[PDB]
Structure formats: C-alpha cells, structure tokens
Amino acid sequence: VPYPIHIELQNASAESIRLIEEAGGSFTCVYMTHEGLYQELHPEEYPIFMDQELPERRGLESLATNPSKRGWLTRWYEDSSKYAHPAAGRRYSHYLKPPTERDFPATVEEYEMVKHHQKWHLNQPGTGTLLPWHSYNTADLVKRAAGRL
Amino acid sequence: SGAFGCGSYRSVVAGTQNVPRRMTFYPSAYELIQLHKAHREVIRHFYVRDKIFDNKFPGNALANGLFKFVPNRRENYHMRELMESIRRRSIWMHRIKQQREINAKVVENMEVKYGKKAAASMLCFTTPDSNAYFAPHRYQDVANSWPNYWQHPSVNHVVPKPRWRRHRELGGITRVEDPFAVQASDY
Amino acid sequence: AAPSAYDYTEVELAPGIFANDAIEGVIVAARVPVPPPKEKQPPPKNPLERLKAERRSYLARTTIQLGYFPNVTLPPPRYETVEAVPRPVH
Amino acid sequence: VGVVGRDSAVGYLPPLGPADPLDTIPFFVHRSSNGVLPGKVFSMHPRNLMPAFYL
Amino acid sequence: YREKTWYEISRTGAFTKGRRPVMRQKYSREALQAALAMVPPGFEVADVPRPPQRILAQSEGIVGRWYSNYWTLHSMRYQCLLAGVEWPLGERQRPRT
Amino acid sequence: PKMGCEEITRKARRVQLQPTEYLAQHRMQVWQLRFKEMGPPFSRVWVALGGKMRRRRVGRQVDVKDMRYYWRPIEPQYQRLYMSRLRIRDHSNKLRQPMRLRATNADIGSGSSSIEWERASNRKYGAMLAPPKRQDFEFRVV
Amino acid sequence: GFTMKYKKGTGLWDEDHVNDYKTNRYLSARATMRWYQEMERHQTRNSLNARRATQSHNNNRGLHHTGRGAFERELERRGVQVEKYPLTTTTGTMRVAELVILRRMELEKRAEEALAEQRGELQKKNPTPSEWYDESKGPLNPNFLRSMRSHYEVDIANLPDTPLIRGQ
Amino acid sequence: SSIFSPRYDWRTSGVHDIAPRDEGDFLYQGPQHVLPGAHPLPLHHPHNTITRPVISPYIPSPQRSHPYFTAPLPELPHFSTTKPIVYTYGTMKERIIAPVFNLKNEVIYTRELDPFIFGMYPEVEELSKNLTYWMVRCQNFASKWDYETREIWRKAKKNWPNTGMGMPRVGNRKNHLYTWGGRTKPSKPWNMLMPTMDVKTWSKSNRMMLTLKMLQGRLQVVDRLTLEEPTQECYLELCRNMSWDVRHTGGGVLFMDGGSRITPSSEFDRAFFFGSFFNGRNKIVRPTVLCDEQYDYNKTAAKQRMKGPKGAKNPIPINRFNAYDAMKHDRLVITEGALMQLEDELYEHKLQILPPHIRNQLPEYGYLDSEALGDCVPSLKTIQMEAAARTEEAESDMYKSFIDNPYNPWKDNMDASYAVDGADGTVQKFVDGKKVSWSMLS
RNA sequence: AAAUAAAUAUAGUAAGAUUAUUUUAGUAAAUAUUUAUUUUUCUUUGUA
RNA sequence: CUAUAUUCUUUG
Numbered sequence A: 001v002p003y004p005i006h007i008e009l010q011n012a013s014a015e016s017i018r019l020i021e022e023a024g025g026s027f028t029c030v031y032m033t034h035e036g037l038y039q040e041l042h043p044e045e046y047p048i049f050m051d052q053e054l055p056e057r058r059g060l061e062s063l064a065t066n067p068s069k070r071g072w073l074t075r076w077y078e079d080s081s082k083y084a085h086p087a088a089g090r091r092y093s094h095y096l097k098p099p100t101e102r103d104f105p106a107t108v109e110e111y112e113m114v115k116h117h118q119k120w121h122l123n124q125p126g127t128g129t130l131l132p133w134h135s136y137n138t139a140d141l142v143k144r145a146a147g148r149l
Numbered sequence B: 001s002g003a004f005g006c007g008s009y010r011s012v013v014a015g016t017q018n019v020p021r022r023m024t025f026y027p028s029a030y031e032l033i034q035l036h037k038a039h040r041e042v043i044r045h046f047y048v049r050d051k052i053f054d055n056k057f058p059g060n061a062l063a064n065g066l067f068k069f070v071p072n073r074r075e076n077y078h079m080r081e082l083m084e085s086i087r088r089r090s091i092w093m094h095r096i097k098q099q100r101e102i103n104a105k106v107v108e109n110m111e112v113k114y115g116k117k118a119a120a121s122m123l124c125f126t127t128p129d130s131n132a133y134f135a136p137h138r139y140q141d142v143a144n145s146w147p148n149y150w151q152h153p154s155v156n157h158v159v160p161k162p163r164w165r166r167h168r169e170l171g172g173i174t175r176v177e178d179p180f181a182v183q184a185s186d187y
Numbered sequence C: 001a002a003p004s005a006y007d008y009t010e011v012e013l014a015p016g017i018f019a020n021d022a023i024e025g026v027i028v029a030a031r032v033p034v035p036p037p038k039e040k041q042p043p044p045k046n047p048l049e050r051l052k053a054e055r056r057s058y059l060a061r062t063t064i065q066l067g068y069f070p071n072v073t074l075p076p077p078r079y080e081t082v083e084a085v086p087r088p089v090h
Numbered sequence D: 001v002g003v004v005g006r007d008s009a010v011g012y013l014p015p016l017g018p019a020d021p022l023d024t025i026p027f028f029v030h031r032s033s034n035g036v037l038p039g040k041v042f043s044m045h046p047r048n049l050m051p052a053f054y055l
Numbered sequence E: 001y002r003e004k005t006w007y008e009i010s011r012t013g014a015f016t017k018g019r020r021p022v023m024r025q026k027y028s029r030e031a032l033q034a035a036l037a038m039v040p041p042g043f044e045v046a047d048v049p050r051p052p053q054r055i056l057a058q059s060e061g062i063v064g065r066w067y068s069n070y071w072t073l074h075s076m077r078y079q080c081l082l083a084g085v086e087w088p089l090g091e092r093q094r095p096r097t
Numbered sequence F: 001p002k003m004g005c006e007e008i009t010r011k012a013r014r015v016q017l018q019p020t021e022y023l024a025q026h027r028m029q030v031w032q033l034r035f036k037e038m039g040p041p042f043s044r045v046w047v048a049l050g051g052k053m054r055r056r057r058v059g060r061q062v063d064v065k066d067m068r069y070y071w072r073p074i075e076p077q078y079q080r081l082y083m084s085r086l087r088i089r090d091h092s093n094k095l096r097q098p099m100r101l102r103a104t105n106a107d108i109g110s111g112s113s114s115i116e117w118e119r120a121s122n123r124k125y126g127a128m129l130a131p132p133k134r135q136d137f138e139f140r141v142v
Numbered sequence G: 001g002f003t004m005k006y007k008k009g010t011g012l013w014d015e016d017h018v019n020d021y022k023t024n025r026y027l028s029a030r031a032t033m034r035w036y037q038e039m040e041r042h043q044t045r046n047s048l049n050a051r052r053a054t055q056s057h058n059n060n061r062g063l064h065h066t067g068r069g070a071f072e073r074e075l076e077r078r079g080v081q082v083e084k085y086p087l088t089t090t091t092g093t094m095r096v097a098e099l100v101i102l103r104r105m106e107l108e109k110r111a112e113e114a115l116a117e118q119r120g121e122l123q124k125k126n127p128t129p130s131e132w133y134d135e136s137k138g139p140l141n142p143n144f145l146r147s148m149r150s151h152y153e154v155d156i157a158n159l160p161d162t163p164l165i166r167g168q
Numbered sequence H: 001s002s003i004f005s006p007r008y009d010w011r012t013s014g015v016h017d018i019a020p021r022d023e024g025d026f027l028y029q030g031p032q033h034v035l036p037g038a039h040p041l042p043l044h045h046p047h048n049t050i051t052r053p054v055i056s057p058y059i060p061s062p063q064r065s066h067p068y069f070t071a072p073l074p075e076l077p078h079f080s081t082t083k084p085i086v087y088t089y090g091t092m093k094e095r096i097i098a099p100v101f102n103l104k105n106e107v108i109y110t111r112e113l114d115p116f117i118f119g120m121y122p123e124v125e126e127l128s129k130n131l132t133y134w135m136v137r138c139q140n141f142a143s144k145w146d147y148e149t150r151e152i153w154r155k156a157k158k159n160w161p162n163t164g165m166g167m168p169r170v171g172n173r174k175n176h177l178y179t180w181g182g183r184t185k186p187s188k189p190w191n192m193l194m195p196t197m198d199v200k201t202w203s204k205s206n207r208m209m210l211t212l213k214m215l216q217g218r219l220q221v222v223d224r225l226t227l228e229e230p231t232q233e234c235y236l237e238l239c240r241n242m243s244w245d246v247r248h249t250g251g252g253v254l255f256m257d258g259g260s261r262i263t264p265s266s267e268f269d270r271a272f273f274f275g276s277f278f279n280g281r282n283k284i285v286r287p288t289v290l291c292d293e294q295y296d297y298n299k300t301a302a303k304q305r306m307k308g309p310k311g312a313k314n315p316i317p318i319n320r321f322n323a324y325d326a327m328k329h330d331r332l333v334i335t336e337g338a339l340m341q342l343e344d345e346l347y348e349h350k351l352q353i354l355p356p357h358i359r360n361q362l363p364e365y366g367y368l369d370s371e372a373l374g375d376c377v378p379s380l381k382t383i384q385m386e387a388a389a390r391t392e393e394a395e396s397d398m399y400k401s402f403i404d405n406p407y408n409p410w411k412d413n414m415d416a417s418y419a420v421d422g423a424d425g426t427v428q429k430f431v432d433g434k435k436v437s438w439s440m441l442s
Numbered sequence I: 001a002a003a004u005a006a007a008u009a010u011a012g013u014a015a016g017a018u019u020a021u022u023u024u025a026g027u028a029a030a031u032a033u034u035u036a037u038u039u040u041u042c043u044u045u046g047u048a
Numbered sequence J: 001c002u003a004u005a006u007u008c009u010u011u012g
C-alpha cells in the first residue's frame, strides 16, 4: 500500500493489517452489535450520542479485545477488565463484587462438594472452584481450538 | 459516532493515533455532487410538506384553504423525512468544509516548496482527452467520438451530396434531380 | 426578515446583464408593494353578453390576479406587530 | 510527485491519449463511472449454468 | 364483536414499545418547565416500574398525574435532555444482587 | 360465460387472488444436513460423505473403512435432480442463476435492500441472524 | 395491510403515487378533465376524511378537536408557546408564494426593457442575414423564414428554385 | 393471406373493374411524369413539408447533423444553458442552438439546448422499451375480468351417472367445455401484469425521444404558454395565429408547460390550462422526463383482497412525456421553464455518469460550485422551490438553542469523553463528569 | 341407507381430447433443447 | 431411522 490509509472495519485478515501498517497507516477493528450497524449507517436519525451496547461474549474474546486483529477494546481490557475486584479472593475473582467476605466456601454443603471435587479431579491447582460435569456444546461459548496467535 | 472526517467513538475508546495524518490534495469532487443533490432534496421536503389545496373544480372546492397533509401527519413528516434530510445535507457540508481547510494547507506548502506556477501546474487534473467531454470541437482531429460517425468531418466524404431543386409547380417541394439506379430483380 | 439570501439570486435579464449588476439596488421581494385583490369582474353594461358571461363555464369564470398558487392576493392584517393585537378576555 | 499520475499499487492511470498524433481513431471508448473498461463477460444461458461464455 | 382480530393482535410491534415513539407532541422549554413544576415533591423516577409486554405502551400527553405514567415520564425526560432543561426528579436505578 | 344464461345471472362464487408459495420452499433441509456445495462460479459440486459406516465397522479392513471419511461429489444426475427443484422459481427467466443451498449475504440483503423495504428499520442490514438486543433490565413478557 | 401510507403525498404533483390502473391510451377532451377531477378528489376525499375522523375522534375523547388537552389549553391563556417547533401556518405559506411571484413580475418588466434595448441595437447592424443563411449544406425552411422576415430590411422568403450558396 | 400460401393469388379476375373512373384516373405519361405519392423509400406516412410543416432553420438534411443553429447568430440575443454543459456517452458532440418563438409568432432571442437532453442520439431498442411500457400500462385493467369454473352457479352433483348410458361421462358440468360454462384459468385483473420500469431507462428513452424530435425538426421553443382569458376561443385564437395544427386529422401539438425564462413553475399556467381542452389532437404534459421509483407492496402474494394488477403499484401517470404521445403529435412545444426544470433535475444525473478522471476536473472548471457552501450566489429556481427555500430560511432560527439542531448536529464530539461500563455492556458519554448520553427506551 | 344443498379428492393398465401446411442436419445408455474443439498420416469419421 | 458407544476407534 503506497500511501497511508486510516480505516475502521471489522475483522481484517492479518496480511491486510500488516500491509496497512507497513505504509504507516492505521487499522481499528470495530465490532458492532446490530444496533451499532444501524446507528452508524443511519447517523442522522439519532441527534444525541446514545448508549451503545458492548458486543457479545465470543466476539469480545475474538475481535474487540484482540491485539492481533487490533480491536478497539484492547485498552479497556488491559486497563479495566483483566483486573479482578481489589478485595476479591481467588474463588470469587470472577464476581463483580465478592458475594461474601471470606474466600473459603461458606456453606458446609458447598464445602463437602468442593472436597469431593478436589478428590474427583486429582488435586490440581484450579480444583477449588466448582465446574459442572456436563456441557452445552453451544457455539456462543466456544473459542479457538488452535491457530496462529 | 462516525460520519465526520475525524473518526468514530470507538476509536477514541481505542485510542488509535489518527491525528498526525499526511494531508493530500483531494478535490472532494464526488461529495459536491452528493451535496448538490442533497440540497436539492431538502427543499423538496420543504415544498411537499407545505402543499395546500388549490382545487380547480367546484365540487372539490370546499377544501381550498387547508394543507394537503393532516396536521398530525405534517408534524411527523417534519420529524422523520424533513429535518433528518437537513442532517444528511449537513454532513456533506462538514466533510467538504474540513477539506478546504486541508487543501489550503496543501496549496501553501506546495507554493512555498515549488512556486506558484509549478505548484498550480501540479495541482491540475487535466487529462489529454478532457477536451472530449468539455469542448469536443478541439478534440475532433484526435478521435471520432460522435454517435454520427458518418457525419464526422474525417468520414464526411462518405455521405452523398444530392443535386436538388425547388419546384413552384409542386408547391415549394424540394426534389433530388439524381437518376435512380436500375436494380437487380431476377434469377 | 430584511433582505433574504435569495433576493440576490442570479437571473440573466439580457445576455451580459444580470439582476445583481444593479448594486440598495436589489429587488427585495417582501418590499414589493402588494396589489389589492381583484374579485370577479362587474357584469357588463348590456344584457346580452351579461347573460352570455353568466352562461359560461365554471373554469372560464375563474378570476385571475397573480396567476400562480393563490390566484388572488390575500389582504394584509390590521396589525403590523404581533403584540399590537388587543387580547380579549379568556 | 504530480497529482494525475500518482503511484497506485493496484495500478490505475487516467487515459494517456493516442500513441501517435496526426492520426484519428474512428472510435472512442468510454470508461465506466467507476473507472472500469467496458468489456463484460457474460454466459450464454446462465440458468442451466453453461460454461459457454461471451463478451 | 372483535375490535381487533387475530392478525392485528398478533402484531406486537404496534402494541409494545420497541423502536417506536409513544408520545407524539413535543413541548417548548417554558412548557416543559411548567409540566415539571406540577410534579409533587418527594417523587423518584425509580418508583415507576416499566410495565410488562402485555400492557399497551401509550402516553396521554401531559395530563394530571402524568408522572405516574412510565412512558410519559421518560419521554418528558428525553425532551428535557434535548432542550437543556434540568431534570428535578431522580433517575432510574438498576438493582443488582 | 352469453347474455341468456340463468347460470351466471344468479351470483354464486367470486374467486380471489391466490397466495404464492414460500420463495425458498424447495431448498429442503434434508439436503442441507447431508451435502454442501463447493465451487467457482459456473462449476459447483455438491459434496457428501459416505455411508457404509454405523452398522458393521469391525473385521472388514482399515482402507475400505477410511475411504468413508472423504468428501465426494454427488453423482451428476442427483445433482441435476436436486438442483432442478431450485430452478423452479423462475422459468423463462434465462438470464437468472439458480438459488444456492445456503443463503449468501447478497440473498439475505436482497430482501431488505429493495425500494419497498427502505423505510422498514426492522430487518434492515440483517436482524434475525444477529443475537437479540439486551432487553430493559426490567423487561418481562407475561 | 401495508399499502405504503407514507408515500401518499410524497409526490411533487397531485397525480402521482396513486395506483391508476383504470385508464386508456387516448384520453378525450372530457376524459382528461375527468382524470384531473378524479386525481384531486382522490387527494381531497382522503384528506378531508382523515380530518373528519380525527376531529370527531378527538371530540369523542372529550378534548379539543386538535388533540390539544386542558393543559395546553391553560398554556395558551398564560401566553406560553405550547409546542417546540412552530411550523409555518396557512397564511404564511400563501404569503411566501405571493412575495416570490411579486419579485418575478417586476423582473419580467426589467428584462423586457433590457432585451428591447439590445434587439434594436443589433438590428441596425444587421439589415442583411449572416452566415446562417447559406443552404450549401441543406435547404432552408420557408416555414421559418416567414418568422425571421421582420428583423431584416429585405425579402428573405423569396427563394430561388436552385439551391443558393451564400445568396445575395 | 400469407405470401407463400396458395390462397394468395386468388381472384384472378374481377379485382378491378376494367374501365377508368373519369375523374381521378390517368395514364402514366413517362419518366418525366411526377406521380402523386411516389417515393423510392418505404414511407408508411408519406408526409412532405406542406402537409406536416416543420419549424426549424433548415430542412433536416444528411449534410446537416441537426437542423438548428450551430453557432449563435450575431443578429439575435443569445442565452446560454442554465447549467454548464457536459458531453456524456450518447451525446451529439456538437453545439445545438435553437431560436425562441414569441406568442405572436415572430422569432425572439436564441437559446442553447442541452446535448445531454436534446442530444442523446436515438437508437430504437430504448424507444421500444418506452413504447411497450406505455401501451401495456395504458390498458384498462379492471375490464379484464372473466368467469371461472367455480363461479357458474350450477348444482355440484353428478348430473347423470356414467354406467349404462351411451351418453358422455359428465358430472358437475359447469366446466369450460359447455356453453354456459367458464374456464379453469381465466383472465382477471389480479393476474394481469403491469410492468415495472426503472428511472434509468425512462430517463434515457425520453431523452432520446426529445432528441428524435429535434432531429426531425419538429421541436419548438416558446417564451410562455399564456392566454388572455381561460376561454377556449382564446386558445384557438392562439393556435390559429401562430400556426399550430390542432385538428384531429392534422398533426397535433404536444405541450410542455413550464412558465417562462424568469418565472418557471412546476404547475401549469392556469389561464392556459383551462383553455387547453379542445377536442382536437393536442396534449399538455408535466415538465419532467424523470419518474419516481416503482414500488410493489404485493411482490409475493401477500394482500389477497387487492384487486389491482400484479406488478408495480405506482405506474407513471398519464400526463407525463412519453414515446407514444410524442409519436402521435408532431410539433413539440416546450416552454423555457420546462427547459430549465429538465436541466435542473438532470444535472447530477449527468455528472455521475462521467468517468472518474473527468469528474475530478468538474470542481476545477467550476461545474460544481454550490450555493449551500456559499462560493457563489444562489441559482435560479422555480417558484415553488424558491417558496420552500425561503420557508427554510425563515425556519432555520428555531433551531439554535436546541441540541437536536440539524444545522449544527453533534457539536460536542471533540470535547467529549467516553466511558465503558463493565457491569452491563454500555459505552456512556460524559462531559464535565455529567452523563450526556441517552440510554434508549426499550 | 334414501333425497336436497356445498366442494375443483384421486384416475402413466381403465380412458378420451389437446386449436395455426408448403419444413432444412443423423441415430446408466439413449433421445431432445441450447452450446463447444479448426490437434497432424493416402483418403475418410457427430466426437463433446 | 432412533438408541448405546464421546479423541485418531466402536454396536444393533
């Protein structure tokens, strides 16, 4: 690409991205919920900037937060999202606010279940947190099996 | 959002560095077309929202003062079709008014770097066939672009010159004096 | 509204002569004096063509003043200021 | 570099004019509104998806 | 008698408020301010739950006790956002577990 | 139907406009589960896997067993036969091209890109193939 | 169903966006008038009905025929502007038209004198027709030469049987 | 019958009485004899200049590319085209200049025509598309109705059992075979096609028809179409004084009524419009060659109680310009208002067609100067469009203090901050710590 | 079950009809419609 | 075809 280009599209291939970046250009991989498409293609209809949804989960994994595709949420991931709550323990890490104070499982039944889980799977580091034995096999939770990083 | 030349909202969140771009001279010729036909459109909306009756037949003449639009509809036509058309036109206007600010700068940089003659000669879009689309009488000896290719002055020799004469006895009729060709009829 | 932007619009009166070449020497459209509304013509002085004119079509009996869109000028209101109108009791 | 003849990786150039002057080409060929040159490859009888083509 | 037959009961786009304006008049500034002035103090927006899908979405304009109407409340809120009128009432709260 | 008829002079029935079939009616999903079409324009195979499989695997041989794991073009008669059901949307439109198995993006957008749909902000730029909008946190269908 | 209600008045004129499938090739002198009757009564019937329905419906709901309730009734008493965007009224939209027309008429006085100022001046330069009068390429039209006669001091329309080439 | 079939050549004697009529008949004198009607070409209408008079400077010849002025003549005022002229694909590539007629039939100032409009060189397939559209469109589709087998009103029962009789096997005899019957698949309006025609084709074909009317020398350009009174005899006084042939038998006049040079209108001149209903061959049409896109809201089957045709539900109305009524009426009388409106509506259209290395030079040449941006003084528009325009000039002041102002939308972008909420995905706008952005309602 | 009133059930081993001559390429596999390849010798060949 | 087989392999 002889001249620099500044472009916002969705999910460009790696070679197109490097071909743009070699020129001194720019690429930002925007990824939009349907409402986003209608609001960009028909800007005149909406006078005020209106609260726009974050795209869904699988698309956030693969596109918006991907440095390789150069998605637009990468800063947000590297600043806000990748850090847990400051109080949060390891088990309660994923929760927005820790449901209890103490990290230890707070129910005798839940504790019995965690013991059984840690002897079920052999004792691996992550075994503390319960993961259910059964699956969805649904496409909205699946991520990349293997590919170039 | 996007739709101006600056960038969308999700590049501000993204923090991509778009600011020190290279400025080039782009005439913005397509947008002027789109603007012409946007501004053409806005006015039409103002006309068709503002129709009122003038009925030229007596049975239909009881309505002659009223708007052709029901007020409840005229309002909605003002919101939906009309005042958003103004916004479209508005966007085109912005995208040109950015770029005159940029083209001024390109012209100044090239005026300093080159000089007015060289600069203005480089910033000219002239194609060697631009006379074909603008003043074709300067292009005639270059190519034959006519739909009448038999009447172009290079091929003009082909069309026949009749010898014709007017007649008073026929009522002002002009008539070709050329003899007809005898035709092959039989085998 | 004082002169409008369009009052400067370019028309070619004669080739090489423009209406903007007069410049105030510009026609301000709202400052043009409005002619009074013409009503239907008074009946002729003669019974014959009065009866024949009364016999005419509804289309032929259409009075023409402007000729375009309201055919007859609307009369100006009694007040030149919007608060100069007396407010009655609600 | 000049504006008309700019570097393009795709390659696109405005028409160069006739390769010889003092000569008149009997025909004149118009580019499309997007800059494309007129030849279109169709198929004769596309419904049955025949490989037989034309221009 | 059926005032609306099965087809026009079936169309929920007309009935529910998706993507549709439910208040069709737009008030000037000193109109909006007077309309806000007739709200009794000690009133939160968060006390007016959004009605379910079964309930028709409509707004009677500014009537007495218009702040009890959900869609009227928030439509007025939008005009107050456009006109640059300060919004005296609260804002909608999202309760979380 | 004649100006004498006692048949037609007493009204009986009046026939209406008849509704048309689903435009995609003939792309049946029993094809769409089995095959998939692969090809460059004007030449496209429909390809499928083999069944000999789920009855007797053991004892035969490994080569004849894994000759089953390859995609293969269907026999051309069957391809013409299945394609023929896709060709019946326009007869005597010779300039057209048959419908594909799976609807392409042009074929999804073609139904919202008309000048009869341009005011419909539903179903524009594809809708029903996107995941649904997050509902108002108090949303309920009752 | 969906018959495209929004395109009903969209058309520039009164006769478009109307499904007119009852028609002919040749329309006579009064069939044409019938056509122009049908179209404007199609607009007027549909507008006046839509006025009547809503005025009556607003009256049955106990409010003003406009749909303008008690509140907006109070605002007009106190002198408050009752709506956000005061669109142009009937009298206004008539006034625009007549001011435009009253500009155009004046201009058509001035243009008249302009052109009459020119035309007399380039007539005195040209008593004889210029190099368009030559029929070397093709015959002149006697239908048109009767129209151009007045300007020149000579008799144009008297045309020799033989074609004339830069004829005097 | 057919040329080949033996039925042809019949009536070997008796076709002509062998004896001359003693009034009209005559012998062929020789090669020096001029026969009435005789011409070497297949003319189905053998009209000469006397029967169908053409008004133009020169009788159209093969030496002349068009029968009009190729250069502005020094003895008349010359008005240039309203919009600047660009030469597109099918254009004549030569200067077309036409005289303007007064209403007193003398020639007044000369005016240059637009070769994009009056120069698009006619080729017959396009005009064919136009003509077939017009003749298929202009049928009465409500009259195509017919009875059908289920519509007959007979008993539905087998009228005699088919076992032992020598009678045909017949039951429920309301079929198409029978004199009182009706067909299986009859004709009826909701099955009849009304053709859809896109703007490109209509525009092109009408342009080529106008050009055809120029090339035949049958085009006339007039100052105004205006009558003293709305009455009919004023109209006939006009048509008689300037030599329009409006008799049924004679070739008619096709009016495009535009207003004038200075005051163009989209509406007809009222005075002229009421006088224009004469029984003769004449037609007054709208001053536009374009058309609205044709929408079909039953494209599938959907609405069943539609009577209608099947097809475009928005057919071109009858008072437009077309190939049919152009071919019927010989003189095409175009008012200058119509000229201006045509050029105005076709300008952007012709600009888009040009190749992109050419469209880039348009701003440089001053073609694209825009009144909205304000680089020039605004241009001449019609009455109605000036009205609308001044309407918006008047109403532009109510949007100033409102944030939804169309004339300055989104002025707050470049001081704006954006904040991504993680509790629920939303990106909310903030200015001065205040939330500006509006969460949508459902 | 009978009569009266409504429907368009199905009928290549039940069937019967199906509207315009003077014509211009042949006989899976065949035949038919549209269309394609100048592949080498002394002559010859409708292959796709 | 439906069930049992759930990694590159397996039943009726």
Ligand SMILES: NC(=O)c1ccc[n+]([C@@H]2O[C@H](COP(=O)([O-])OP(=O)(O)OC[C@H]3O[C@@H](n4cnc5c(N)ncnc54)[C@H](O)[C@@H]3O)[C@@H](O)[C@H]2O)c1
Binding pocket: A045, A046, A047, E018, E019, E020, E021, E022, E023, E024, E025, E026, E027, E074, E075, E076, E078, E079, E082, G084, H404, H439, H440, H441, H442
């Ligand atoms: N899918 C959508 O929700 C959608 C689609 C297209 C446009 N919009 C636009 O989104 C914005 C708000 O949508 P919402 O659904 O959250 O509220 P809403 O549009 O349902 O209700 C908004 C309230 O404010 C009024 N209003 C709308 N525009 C106004 C204006 N320009 N000036 C004064 N009052 C106005 C509405 O008529 C109503 O009274 C509006 O511009 C709306 O037209 C929304």
